[PDB]
Amino acid sequence: IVCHTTATIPSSAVTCPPGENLCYRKMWCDAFCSSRGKVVELGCAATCPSKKPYEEVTCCSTDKCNHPPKRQPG
Amino acid sequence: IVCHTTATIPSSAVTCPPGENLCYRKMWCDAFCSSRGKVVELGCAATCPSKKPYEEVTCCSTDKCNHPPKRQPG
């Protein structure tokens, strides 16, 4: 009873794989900052893995969660 | 070059340690969501290892990032 949004491909809620609790998110400006932001990754497939590498991140877990403000993935 | 909020106490905008980027947001809902929600974390201390699973987390880096909700006109 995780996140009803994208959480993998033809985004249409998923409701995760095994688990319960948290929706995790990452990335905002692809890397060529000169305005977009619709190249993302939102959902859950395990242990708020967390992650590492780039800019913004998030270990949501309050209902639904991640609709990329600007737009929306799909 | 980061953050101006809490982040190791009374806050003085500091802009924490060394490195170059960010300040680590973490926390909020005690474990008594018997209302409110205001005993946080949100400082800095090297490299947002990321952290753990208690509710609410992240890793901002957008200039600044943390002063927290509900509250009173200052």
PDB file of all heavy atoms in Angstrom, chain A residues 12-53:
ATOM      1  N   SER A  12       0.912   3.211 -13.765  1.00  0.00           N
ATOM      2  CA  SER A  12      -0.494   3.031 -13.340  1.00  0.00           C
ATOM      3  C   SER A  12      -0.569   2.280 -11.967  1.00  0.00           C
ATOM      4  O   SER A  12      -1.082   1.140 -11.888  1.00  0.00           O
ATOM      5  CB  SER A  12      -1.216   2.240 -14.399  1.00  0.00           C
ATOM      6  OG  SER A  12      -0.216   1.611 -15.153  1.00  0.00           O
ATOM      7  N   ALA A  13      -0.113   2.968 -10.934  1.00  0.00           N
ATOM      8  CA  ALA A  13       0.146   2.864  -9.576  1.00  0.00           C
ATOM      9  C   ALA A  13       1.139   1.782  -9.108  1.00  0.00           C
ATOM     10  O   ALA A  13       1.850   2.267  -8.194  1.00  0.00           O
ATOM     11  CB  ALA A  13      -1.012   2.893  -8.623  1.00  0.00           C
ATOM     12  N   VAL A  14       1.184   0.555  -9.485  1.00  0.00           N
ATOM     13  CA  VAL A  14       1.970  -0.619  -9.146  1.00  0.00           C
ATOM     14  C   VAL A  14       1.587  -1.227  -7.789  1.00  0.00           C
ATOM     15  O   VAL A  14       1.267  -2.436  -7.695  1.00  0.00           O
ATOM     16  CB  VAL A  14       3.491  -0.541  -9.276  1.00  0.00           C
ATOM     17  CG1 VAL A  14       4.213  -1.705  -8.609  1.00  0.00           C
ATOM     18  CG2 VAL A  14       4.042  -0.307 -10.657  1.00  0.00           C
ATOM     19  N   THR A  15       1.724  -0.423  -6.712  1.00  0.00           N
ATOM     20  CA  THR A  15       1.421  -0.896  -5.342  1.00  0.00           C
ATOM     21  C   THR A  15       2.504  -1.839  -4.838  1.00  0.00           C
ATOM     22  O   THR A  15       2.305  -2.763  -3.953  1.00  0.00           O
ATOM     23  CB  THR A  15       0.001  -1.455  -5.311  1.00  0.00           C
ATOM     24  OG1 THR A  15      -0.737  -0.754  -6.307  1.00  0.00           O
ATOM     25  CG2 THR A  15      -0.647  -1.422  -3.929  1.00  0.00           C
ATOM     26  N   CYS A  16       3.684  -1.578  -5.346  1.00  0.00           N
ATOM     27  CA  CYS A  16       4.946  -2.232  -5.156  1.00  0.00           C
ATOM     28  C   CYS A  16       4.977  -3.728  -5.404  1.00  0.00           C
ATOM     29  O   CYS A  16       4.209  -4.187  -6.284  1.00  0.00           O
ATOM     30  CB  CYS A  16       5.831  -1.679  -4.043  1.00  0.00           C
ATOM     31  SG  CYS A  16       5.620   0.119  -3.927  1.00  0.00           S
ATOM     32  N   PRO A  17       5.943  -4.373  -4.862  1.00  0.00           N
ATOM     33  CA  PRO A  17       6.397  -5.803  -4.868  1.00  0.00           C
ATOM     34  C   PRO A  17       6.319  -5.960  -3.317  1.00  0.00           C
ATOM     35  O   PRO A  17       5.747  -5.003  -2.779  1.00  0.00           O
ATOM     36  CB  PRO A  17       7.878  -5.714  -5.158  1.00  0.00           C
ATOM     37  CG  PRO A  17       8.238  -4.278  -4.848  1.00  0.00           C
ATOM     38  CD  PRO A  17       7.023  -3.755  -3.983  1.00  0.00           C
ATOM     39  N   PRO A  18       7.069  -6.887  -2.836  1.00  0.00           N
ATOM     40  CA  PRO A  18       6.966  -7.201  -1.366  1.00  0.00           C
ATOM     41  C   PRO A  18       7.353  -5.976  -0.585  1.00  0.00           C
ATOM     42  O   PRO A  18       8.030  -5.064  -1.148  1.00  0.00           O
ATOM     43  CB  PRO A  18       7.780  -8.443  -1.195  1.00  0.00           C
ATOM     44  CG  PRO A  18       8.309  -8.949  -2.502  1.00  0.00           C
ATOM     45  CD  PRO A  18       7.850  -7.939  -3.567  1.00  0.00           C
ATOM     46  N   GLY A  19       6.910  -5.867   0.662  1.00  0.00           N
ATOM     47  CA  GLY A  19       7.396  -4.705   1.455  1.00  0.00           C
ATOM     48  C   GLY A  19       6.447  -4.114   2.455  1.00  0.00           C
ATOM     49  O   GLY A  19       6.189  -4.721   3.504  1.00  0.00           O
ATOM     50  N   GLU A  20       5.886  -2.921   2.071  1.00  0.00           N
ATOM     51  CA  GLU A  20       4.993  -2.143   2.925  1.00  0.00           C
ATOM     52  C   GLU A  20       5.827  -0.963   3.494  1.00  0.00           C
ATOM     53  O   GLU A  20       6.899  -1.107   4.158  1.00  0.00           O
ATOM     54  CB  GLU A  20       4.352  -2.874   4.069  1.00  0.00           C
ATOM     55  CG  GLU A  20       3.310  -3.961   4.000  1.00  0.00           C
ATOM     56  CD  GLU A  20       3.376  -5.179   3.122  1.00  0.00           C
ATOM     57  OE1 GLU A  20       3.606  -5.154   1.879  1.00  0.00           O
ATOM     58  OE2 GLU A  20       3.122  -6.305   3.742  1.00  0.00           O
ATOM     59  N   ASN A  21       5.326   0.225   3.146  1.00  0.00           N
ATOM     60  CA  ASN A  21       5.970   1.478   3.544  1.00  0.00           C
ATOM     61  C   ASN A  21       7.130   1.828   2.570  1.00  0.00           C
ATOM     62  O   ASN A  21       7.866   0.963   2.098  1.00  0.00           O
ATOM     63  CB  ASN A  21       6.416   1.447   5.012  1.00  0.00           C
ATOM     64  CG  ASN A  21       7.945   1.379   5.099  1.00  0.00           C
ATOM     65  OD1 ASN A  21       8.611   2.342   4.547  1.00  0.00           O
ATOM     66  ND2 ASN A  21       8.411   0.307   5.711  1.00  0.00           N
ATOM     67  N   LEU A  22       7.230   3.060   2.312  1.00  0.00           N
ATOM     68  CA  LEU A  22       7.959   3.997   1.549  1.00  0.00           C
ATOM     69  C   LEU A  22       7.951   3.932   0.038  1.00  0.00           C
ATOM     70  O   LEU A  22       8.156   2.805  -0.641  1.00  0.00           O
ATOM     71  CB  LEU A  22       9.303   4.354   2.141  1.00  0.00           C
ATOM     72  CG  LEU A  22      10.581   3.622   1.838  1.00  0.00           C
ATOM     73  CD1 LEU A  22      11.073   2.932   3.082  1.00  0.00           C
ATOM     74  CD2 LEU A  22      10.454   2.702   0.662  1.00  0.00           C
ATOM     75  N   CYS A  23       7.842   5.105  -0.497  1.00  0.00           N
ATOM     76  CA  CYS A  23       7.913   5.368  -1.954  1.00  0.00           C
ATOM     77  C   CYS A  23       9.247   6.085  -2.222  1.00  0.00           C
ATOM     78  O   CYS A  23       9.255   7.268  -1.854  1.00  0.00           O
ATOM     79  CB  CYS A  23       6.800   6.352  -2.305  1.00  0.00           C
ATOM     80  SG  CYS A  23       5.129   5.871  -1.978  1.00  0.00           S
ATOM     81  N   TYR A  24      10.238   5.529  -2.903  1.00  0.00           N
ATOM     82  CA  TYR A  24      11.466   6.358  -3.091  1.00  0.00           C
ATOM     83  C   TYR A  24      11.700   6.950  -4.454  1.00  0.00           C
ATOM     84  O   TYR A  24      11.539   6.340  -5.566  1.00  0.00           O
ATOM     85  CB  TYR A  24      12.596   5.596  -2.374  1.00  0.00           C
ATOM     86  CG  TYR A  24      13.356   4.621  -3.252  1.00  0.00           C
ATOM     87  CD1 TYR A  24      14.623   4.944  -3.808  1.00  0.00           C
ATOM     88  CD2 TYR A  24      12.844   3.360  -3.496  1.00  0.00           C
ATOM     89  CE1 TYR A  24      15.270   4.049  -4.637  1.00  0.00           C
ATOM     90  CE2 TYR A  24      13.478   2.434  -4.309  1.00  0.00           C
ATOM     91  CZ  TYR A  24      14.696   2.801  -4.908  1.00  0.00           C
ATOM     92  OH  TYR A  24      15.302   1.840  -5.637  1.00  0.00           O
ATOM     93  N   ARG A  25      12.144   8.237  -4.472  1.00  0.00           N
ATOM     94  CA  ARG A  25      12.367   9.063  -5.637  1.00  0.00           C
ATOM     95  C   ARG A  25      13.820   9.597  -5.823  1.00  0.00           C
ATOM     96  O   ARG A  25      14.535   9.656  -4.867  1.00  0.00           O
ATOM     97  CB  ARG A  25      11.420  10.268  -5.756  1.00  0.00           C
ATOM     98  CG  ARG A  25       9.965  10.128  -5.449  1.00  0.00           C
ATOM     99  CD  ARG A  25       9.245  11.399  -5.161  1.00  0.00           C
ATOM    100  NE  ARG A  25       9.387  12.565  -6.023  1.00  0.00           N
ATOM    101  CZ  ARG A  25      10.089  13.653  -5.662  1.00  0.00           C
ATOM    102  NH1 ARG A  25      10.624  13.657  -4.423  1.00  0.00           N
ATOM    103  NH2 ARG A  25      10.335  14.758  -6.332  1.00  0.00           N
ATOM    104  N   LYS A  26      14.169   9.999  -7.054  1.00  0.00           N
ATOM    105  CA  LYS A  26      15.457  10.555  -7.456  1.00  0.00           C
ATOM    106  C   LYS A  26      15.432  11.230  -8.823  1.00  0.00           C
ATOM    107  O   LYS A  26      14.656  10.813  -9.695  1.00  0.00           O
ATOM    108  CB  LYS A  26      16.612   9.520  -7.446  1.00  0.00           C
ATOM    109  CG  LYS A  26      18.003  10.075  -7.752  1.00  0.00           C
ATOM    110  CD  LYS A  26      19.120   9.031  -7.755  1.00  0.00           C
ATOM    111  CE  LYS A  26      20.460   9.648  -7.992  1.00  0.00           C
ATOM    112  NZ  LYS A  26      21.726   8.943  -7.766  1.00  0.00           N
ATOM    113  N   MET A  27      16.299  12.171  -9.017  1.00  0.00           N
ATOM    114  CA  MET A  27      16.720  13.001 -10.153  1.00  0.00           C
ATOM    115  C   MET A  27      15.784  14.152 -10.513  1.00  0.00           C
ATOM    116  O   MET A  27      14.565  14.030 -10.311  1.00  0.00           O
ATOM    117  CB  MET A  27      17.299  12.190 -11.342  1.00  0.00           C
ATOM    118  CG  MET A  27      16.742  10.951 -11.918  1.00  0.00           C
ATOM    119  SD  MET A  27      16.304  10.805 -13.636  1.00  0.00           S
ATOM    120  CE  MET A  27      17.819  11.058 -14.496  1.00  0.00           C
ATOM    121  N   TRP A  28      16.296  15.279 -11.034  1.00  0.00           N
ATOM    122  CA  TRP A  28      15.535  16.457 -11.460  1.00  0.00           C
ATOM    123  C   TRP A  28      16.000  17.158 -12.760  1.00  0.00           C
ATOM    124  O   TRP A  28      15.211  17.348 -13.699  1.00  0.00           O
ATOM    125  CB  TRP A  28      15.226  17.505 -10.327  1.00  0.00           C
ATOM    126  CG  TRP A  28      13.793  17.973 -10.586  1.00  0.00           C
ATOM    127  CD1 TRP A  28      13.367  18.705 -11.627  1.00  0.00           C
ATOM    128  CD2 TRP A  28      12.669  17.679  -9.779  1.00  0.00           C
ATOM    129  NE1 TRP A  28      11.950  18.843 -11.497  1.00  0.00           N
ATOM    130  CE2 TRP A  28      11.559  18.220 -10.413  1.00  0.00           C
ATOM    131  CE3 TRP A  28      12.502  16.989  -8.576  1.00  0.00           C
ATOM    132  CZ2 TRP A  28      10.257  18.082  -9.923  1.00  0.00           C
ATOM    133  CZ3 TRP A  28      11.188  16.871  -8.079  1.00  0.00           C
ATOM    134  CH2 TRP A  28      10.119  17.387  -8.725  1.00  0.00           C
ATOM    135  N   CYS A  29      17.234  17.571 -12.881  1.00  0.00           N
ATOM    136  CA  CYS A  29      17.690  18.137 -14.168  1.00  0.00           C
ATOM    137  C   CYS A  29      18.725  17.188 -14.754  1.00  0.00           C
ATOM    138  O   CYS A  29      19.863  17.111 -14.268  1.00  0.00           O
ATOM    139  CB  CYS A  29      18.318  19.520 -13.996  1.00  0.00           C
ATOM    140  SG  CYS A  29      19.034  20.167 -15.588  1.00  0.00           S
ATOM    141  N   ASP A  30      18.254  16.505 -15.774  1.00  0.00           N
ATOM    142  CA  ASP A  30      18.995  15.481 -16.520  1.00  0.00           C
ATOM    143  C   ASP A  30      20.487  15.696 -16.472  1.00  0.00           C
ATOM    144  O   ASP A  30      21.270  14.741 -16.366  1.00  0.00           O
ATOM    145  CB  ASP A  30      18.595  15.518 -17.985  1.00  0.00           C
ATOM    146  CG  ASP A  30      18.139  16.906 -18.415  1.00  0.00           C
ATOM    147  OD1 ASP A  30      17.516  17.665 -17.578  1.00  0.00           O
ATOM    148  OD2 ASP A  30      18.375  17.321 -19.612  1.00  0.00           O
ATOM    149  N   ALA A  31      20.892  16.912 -16.552  1.00  0.00           N
ATOM    150  CA  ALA A  31      22.307  17.173 -16.535  1.00  0.00           C
ATOM    151  C   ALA A  31      22.657  18.194 -17.570  1.00  0.00           C
ATOM    152  O   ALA A  31      23.813  18.624 -17.678  1.00  0.00           O
ATOM    153  CB  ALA A  31      23.075  15.886 -16.839  1.00  0.00           C
ATOM    154  N   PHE A  32      21.670  18.579 -18.318  1.00  0.00           N
ATOM    155  CA  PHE A  32      21.849  19.617 -19.329  1.00  0.00           C
ATOM    156  C   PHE A  32      20.759  20.752 -19.087  1.00  0.00           C
ATOM    157  O   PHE A  32      19.816  20.925 -19.883  1.00  0.00           O
ATOM    158  CB  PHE A  32      21.812  18.969 -20.738  1.00  0.00           C
ATOM    159  CG  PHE A  32      22.132  17.439 -20.815  1.00  0.00           C
ATOM    160  CD1 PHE A  32      21.168  16.496 -20.417  1.00  0.00           C
ATOM    161  CD2 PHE A  32      23.368  16.973 -21.313  1.00  0.00           C
ATOM    162  CE1 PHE A  32      21.423  15.119 -20.536  1.00  0.00           C
ATOM    163  CE2 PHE A  32      23.619  15.590 -21.437  1.00  0.00           C
ATOM    164  CZ  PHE A  32      22.642  14.669 -21.055  1.00  0.00           C
ATOM    165  N   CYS A  33      21.038  21.437 -17.962  1.00  0.00           N
ATOM    166  CA  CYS A  33      20.260  22.527 -17.325  1.00  0.00           C
ATOM    167  C   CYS A  33      20.373  23.798 -18.181  1.00  0.00           C
ATOM    168  O   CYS A  33      21.369  24.540 -18.122  1.00  0.00           O
ATOM    169  CB  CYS A  33      20.753  22.480 -15.910  1.00  0.00           C
ATOM    170  SG  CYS A  33      21.213  20.705 -15.638  1.00  0.00           S
ATOM    171  N   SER A  34      19.269  23.772 -18.842  1.00  0.00           N
ATOM    172  CA  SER A  34      18.790  24.658 -19.817  1.00  0.00           C
ATOM    173  C   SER A  34      17.309  24.251 -20.072  1.00  0.00           C
ATOM    174  O   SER A  34      16.894  24.107 -21.223  1.00  0.00           O
ATOM    175  CB  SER A  34      19.645  24.524 -21.086  1.00  0.00           C
ATOM    176  OG  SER A  34      21.017  24.396 -20.739  1.00  0.00           O
ATOM    177  N   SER A  35      16.576  24.033 -18.941  1.00  0.00           N
ATOM    178  CA  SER A  35      15.044  23.792 -18.776  1.00  0.00           C
ATOM    179  C   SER A  35      14.270  22.579 -19.481  1.00  0.00           C
ATOM    180  O   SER A  35      14.047  22.583 -20.713  1.00  0.00           O
ATOM    181  CB  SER A  35      14.285  25.021 -19.242  1.00  0.00           C
ATOM    182  OG  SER A  35      14.985  26.190 -18.848  1.00  0.00           O
ATOM    183  N   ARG A  36      13.872  21.632 -18.551  1.00  0.00           N
ATOM    184  CA  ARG A  36      13.023  20.379 -18.768  1.00  0.00           C
ATOM    185  C   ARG A  36      12.670  19.788 -17.369  1.00  0.00           C
ATOM    186  O   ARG A  36      11.898  20.382 -16.602  1.00  0.00           O
ATOM    187  CB  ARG A  36      13.724  19.423 -19.746  1.00  0.00           C
ATOM    188  CG  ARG A  36      13.566  19.971 -21.179  1.00  0.00           C
ATOM    189  CD  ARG A  36      13.881  19.004 -22.354  1.00  0.00           C
ATOM    190  NE  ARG A  36      15.269  18.916 -22.306  1.00  0.00           N
ATOM    191  CZ  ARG A  36      16.158  19.531 -23.024  1.00  0.00           C
ATOM    192  NH1 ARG A  36      15.956  20.092 -24.238  1.00  0.00           N
ATOM    193  NH2 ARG A  36      17.226  19.879 -22.448  1.00  0.00           N
ATOM    194  N   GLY A  37      13.225  18.600 -17.084  1.00  0.00           N
ATOM    195  CA  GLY A  37      13.042  17.913 -15.776  1.00  0.00           C
ATOM    196  C   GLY A  37      12.201  16.605 -15.859  1.00  0.00           C
ATOM    197  O   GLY A  37      11.989  15.918 -14.849  1.00  0.00           O
ATOM    198  N   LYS A  38      11.723  16.258 -17.047  1.00  0.00           N
ATOM    199  CA  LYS A  38      10.886  15.034 -17.249  1.00  0.00           C
ATOM    200  C   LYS A  38      11.771  13.836 -17.734  1.00  0.00           C
ATOM    201  O   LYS A  38      11.675  13.206 -18.793  1.00  0.00           O
ATOM    202  CB  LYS A  38       9.830  15.299 -18.332  1.00  0.00           C
ATOM    203  CG  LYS A  38       8.421  15.551 -17.788  1.00  0.00           C
ATOM    204  CD  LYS A  38       7.383  15.715 -18.903  1.00  0.00           C
ATOM    205  CE  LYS A  38       7.532  14.673 -20.018  1.00  0.00           C
ATOM    206  NZ  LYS A  38       8.180  15.210 -21.224  1.00  0.00           N
ATOM    207  N   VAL A  39      12.595  13.409 -16.805  1.00  0.00           N
ATOM    208  CA  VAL A  39      13.512  12.292 -16.922  1.00  0.00           C
ATOM    209  C   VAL A  39      14.043  12.085 -15.426  1.00  0.00           C
ATOM    210  O   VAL A  39      15.027  12.755 -15.063  1.00  0.00           O
ATOM    211  CB  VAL A  39      14.719  12.544 -17.833  1.00  0.00           C
ATOM    212  CG1 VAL A  39      14.665  11.742 -19.131  1.00  0.00           C
ATOM    213  CG2 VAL A  39      14.841  14.056 -18.042  1.00  0.00           C
ATOM    214  N   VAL A  40      13.245  11.209 -14.908  1.00  0.00           N
ATOM    215  CA  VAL A  40      12.961  10.697 -13.618  1.00  0.00           C
ATOM    216  C   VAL A  40      12.861   9.176 -13.379  1.00  0.00           C
ATOM    217  O   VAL A  40      12.943   8.208 -14.118  1.00  0.00           O
ATOM    218  CB  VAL A  40      11.654  11.447 -13.134  1.00  0.00           C
ATOM    219  CG1 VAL A  40      11.998  12.777 -12.329  1.00  0.00           C
ATOM    220  CG2 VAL A  40      10.780  11.954 -14.287  1.00  0.00           C
ATOM    221  N   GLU A  41      12.661   8.945 -12.053  1.00  0.00           N
ATOM    222  CA  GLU A  41      12.538   7.565 -11.514  1.00  0.00           C
ATOM    223  C   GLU A  41      11.931   7.699 -10.135  1.00  0.00           C
ATOM    224  O   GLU A  41      12.437   8.469  -9.287  1.00  0.00           O
ATOM    225  CB  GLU A  41      13.894   6.933 -11.366  1.00  0.00           C
ATOM    226  CG  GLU A  41      13.978   5.539 -10.728  1.00  0.00           C
ATOM    227  CD  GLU A  41      15.277   4.861 -11.094  1.00  0.00           C
ATOM    228  OE1 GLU A  41      16.084   5.819 -11.515  1.00  0.00           O
ATOM    229  OE2 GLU A  41      15.458   3.656 -10.935  1.00  0.00           O
ATOM    230  N   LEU A  42      10.767   7.107 -10.018  1.00  0.00           N
ATOM    231  CA  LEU A  42       9.754   7.078  -9.007  1.00  0.00           C
ATOM    232  C   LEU A  42       9.061   5.716  -8.816  1.00  0.00           C
ATOM    233  O   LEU A  42       8.309   5.264  -9.695  1.00  0.00           O
ATOM    234  CB  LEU A  42       8.574   7.977  -9.490  1.00  0.00           C
ATOM    235  CG  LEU A  42       8.822   9.169 -10.318  1.00  0.00           C
ATOM    236  CD1 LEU A  42       9.835   8.922 -11.357  1.00  0.00           C
ATOM    237  CD2 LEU A  42       7.608   9.899 -10.846  1.00  0.00           C
ATOM    238  N   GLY A  43       9.037   5.276  -7.533  1.00  0.00           N
ATOM    239  CA  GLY A  43       8.384   4.111  -7.105  1.00  0.00           C
ATOM    240  C   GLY A  43       8.693   3.369  -5.859  1.00  0.00           C
ATOM    241  O   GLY A  43       8.195   3.635  -4.714  1.00  0.00           O
ATOM    242  N   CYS A  44       9.404   2.270  -6.108  1.00  0.00           N
ATOM    243  CA  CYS A  44       9.638   1.279  -5.017  1.00  0.00           C
ATOM    244  C   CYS A  44       9.812  -0.139  -5.583  1.00  0.00           C
ATOM    245  O   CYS A  44       9.092  -0.637  -6.475  1.00  0.00           O
ATOM    246  CB  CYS A  44       8.430   1.329  -4.053  1.00  0.00           C
ATOM    247  SG  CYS A  44       6.847   1.154  -4.958  1.00  0.00           S
ATOM    248  N   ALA A  45      10.832  -0.806  -5.132  1.00  0.00           N
ATOM    249  CA  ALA A  45      11.216  -2.176  -5.473  1.00  0.00           C
ATOM    250  C   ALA A  45      12.275  -2.362  -4.418  1.00  0.00           C
ATOM    251  O   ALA A  45      13.485  -2.337  -4.674  1.00  0.00           O
ATOM    252  CB  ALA A  45      11.615  -2.387  -6.901  1.00  0.00           C
ATOM    253  N   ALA A  46      11.784  -2.444  -3.222  1.00  0.00           N
ATOM    254  CA  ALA A  46      12.652  -2.672  -2.114  1.00  0.00           C
ATOM    255  C   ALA A  46      12.997  -1.418  -1.262  1.00  0.00           C
ATOM    256  O   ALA A  46      12.461  -0.322  -1.481  1.00  0.00           O
ATOM    257  CB  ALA A  46      13.984  -3.234  -2.617  1.00  0.00           C
ATOM    258  N   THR A  47      13.896  -1.826  -0.369  1.00  0.00           N
ATOM    259  CA  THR A  47      14.407  -1.210   0.913  1.00  0.00           C
ATOM    260  C   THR A  47      14.972   0.223   0.873  1.00  0.00           C
ATOM    261  O   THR A  47      16.181   0.451   1.152  1.00  0.00           O
ATOM    262  CB  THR A  47      15.351  -2.272   1.512  1.00  0.00           C
ATOM    263  OG1 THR A  47      16.699  -1.996   1.167  1.00  0.00           O
ATOM    264  CG2 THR A  47      15.025  -3.688   1.027  1.00  0.00           C
ATOM    265  N   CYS A  48      14.014   1.149   0.607  1.00  0.00           N
ATOM    266  CA  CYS A  48      14.382   2.523   0.310  1.00  0.00           C
ATOM    267  C   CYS A  48      15.843   2.426   0.113  1.00  0.00           C
ATOM    268  O   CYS A  48      16.643   2.958   0.904  1.00  0.00           O
ATOM    269  CB  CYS A  48      14.038   3.521   1.391  1.00  0.00           C
ATOM    270  SG  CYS A  48      14.751   5.175   0.956  1.00  0.00           S
ATOM    271  N   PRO A  49      16.156   1.787  -0.961  1.00  0.00           N
ATOM    272  CA  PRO A  49      17.512   1.437  -1.217  1.00  0.00           C
ATOM    273  C   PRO A  49      18.380   2.579  -0.733  1.00  0.00           C
ATOM    274  O   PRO A  49      19.482   2.312  -0.162  1.00  0.00           O
ATOM    275  CB  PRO A  49      17.460   1.142  -2.702  1.00  0.00           C
ATOM    276  CG  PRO A  49      15.998   1.193  -3.137  1.00  0.00           C
ATOM    277  CD  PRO A  49      15.136   1.393  -1.925  1.00  0.00           C
ATOM    278  N   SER A  50      17.759   3.719  -0.981  1.00  0.00           N
ATOM    279  CA  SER A  50      18.253   5.103  -0.856  1.00  0.00           C
ATOM    280  C   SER A  50      18.763   5.465  -2.222  1.00  0.00           C
ATOM    281  O   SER A  50      17.995   5.897  -3.094  1.00  0.00           O
ATOM    282  CB  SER A  50      19.454   5.272   0.088  1.00  0.00           C
ATOM    283  OG  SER A  50      19.096   4.927   1.416  1.00  0.00           O
ATOM    284  N   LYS A  51      20.058   5.267  -2.332  1.00  0.00           N
ATOM    285  CA  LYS A  51      20.827   5.517  -3.550  1.00  0.00           C
ATOM    286  C   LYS A  51      22.040   6.383  -3.234  1.00  0.00           C
ATOM    287  O   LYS A  51      22.437   6.536  -2.070  1.00  0.00           O
ATOM    288  CB  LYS A  51      19.950   6.159  -4.609  1.00  0.00           C
ATOM    289  CG  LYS A  51      19.382   5.118  -5.573  1.00  0.00           C
ATOM    290  CD  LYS A  51      18.602   5.741  -6.728  1.00  0.00           C
ATOM    291  CE  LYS A  51      17.843   4.709  -7.562  1.00  0.00           C
ATOM    292  NZ  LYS A  51      18.478   4.446  -8.862  1.00  0.00           N
ATOM    293  N   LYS A  52      22.632   6.934  -4.255  1.00  0.00           N
ATOM    294  CA  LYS A  52      23.842   7.718  -4.058  1.00  0.00           C
ATOM    295  C   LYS A  52      23.905   8.903  -5.013  1.00  0.00           C
ATOM    296  O   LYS A  52      23.207   9.889  -4.780  1.00  0.00           O
ATOM    297  CB  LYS A  52      25.061   6.831  -4.288  1.00  0.00           C
ATOM    298  CG  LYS A  52      24.779   5.351  -4.037  1.00  0.00           C
ATOM    299  CD  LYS A  52      26.041   4.545  -3.731  1.00  0.00           C
ATOM    300  CE  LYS A  52      26.301   4.445  -2.232  1.00  0.00           C
ATOM    301  NZ  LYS A  52      25.455   5.357  -1.447  1.00  0.00           N
ATOM    302  N   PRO A  53      24.671   8.666  -6.049  1.00  0.00           N
ATOM    303  CA  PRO A  53      25.072   9.530  -7.062  1.00  0.00           C
ATOM    304  C   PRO A  53      24.810  10.910  -7.442  1.00  0.00           C
ATOM    305  O   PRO A  53      25.860  11.646  -7.459  1.00  0.00           O
ATOM    306  CB  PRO A  53      25.361   8.540  -8.227  1.00  0.00           C
ATOM    307  CG  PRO A  53      26.278   7.513  -7.489  1.00  0.00           C
ATOM    308  CD  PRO A  53      25.483   7.362  -6.167  1.00  0.00           C
TER     309      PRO A  53
END
